[PDB]
DNA sequence: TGCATCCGTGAGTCGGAGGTAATAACCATAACGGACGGGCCTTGTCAAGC
C-alpha cells in the first residue's frame, strides 16, 4: 500500500537524522525457514499457473460449448512439475541411511544453498561466520 | 587531463556415490522408396572316367 511507502520514506529519512535502528542481515530474526510444505505450494503455484493458461487457450480457442469439466482439466503440468521439485531440486536429496543417528541428522539440516538462497560462488566469509544469535538455535 | 564507472579475467589436487526432462491443429494428394517376386547367371558340391 502506499502508506507502506510513506512509512518506509519516513524511516529512512528519519535515519538521517539519527533516529531507528539498521538491521544486520545474517541475524537469525531476519531469517527464516522454509520446510517441504511452502517449496511444495510455491511448485503447485507454478504448475496451476500453467494449468490455468492451458484452460484459458482451450476455452477461447472453442467456439462450440456444452463442455465436460474433465475435457479443459490437463493434468500433466502439475505432474511435471511436482516430479521436477521431487527429482531435481537442491533441496530433495538422497538421504543419509547408513545408522539411526544419520538418519536422524539427515532430517534436521539447515542448508542456505537453493533456489531463492545463495551460490556457493557468492559464499563469502561473514555468511560462514558465527553469528551471535546463533546461540541455542543453530 | 584526473577521477569515477564498467567490464572481463581469475579463484588447489585426487577418489567414491548417484544419475535426466518433464505442458501445446488437422486434412487431401501425389511423389517417393523399401520390400517382394521371377530371370538369368555365377558359384559350390557329388559322381563317374582317363
Known sequence: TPQ???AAINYLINLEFDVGTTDDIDHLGNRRV??????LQNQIRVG???LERII????????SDALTPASL??????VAAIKEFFG???????????NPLAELTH???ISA??????????????????????????
Do not use: C, W, Y
Not at 34 to 39: A, Q, T
Not at 114 to 138: M, Q, Y
Open 4 to 6: 507502506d511507502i510513506l
Open 34 to 39: 522454509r520446510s517441504v510444505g511452502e517449496l
Open 48 to 50: 496451476l499457473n500453467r
Open 56 to 63: 484459458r487457450e482451450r476455452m477461447t480457442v472453442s467456439e
Open 73 to 78: 482439466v490437463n493434468p500433466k503440468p502439475l
Open 88 to 98: 531435481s531440486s537442491q533441496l530433495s536429496q538422497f538421504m543419509d541411511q547408513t
Open 107 to 109: 532430517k534436521r539440516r
Open 113 to 138: 544453498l537453493g533456489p531463492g538462497g545463495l551460490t556457493r560462488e557468492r559464499a563469502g566469509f561473514a555468511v560462514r561466520d558465527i553469528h551471535p544469535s546463533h546461540h541455542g538455535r543453530i
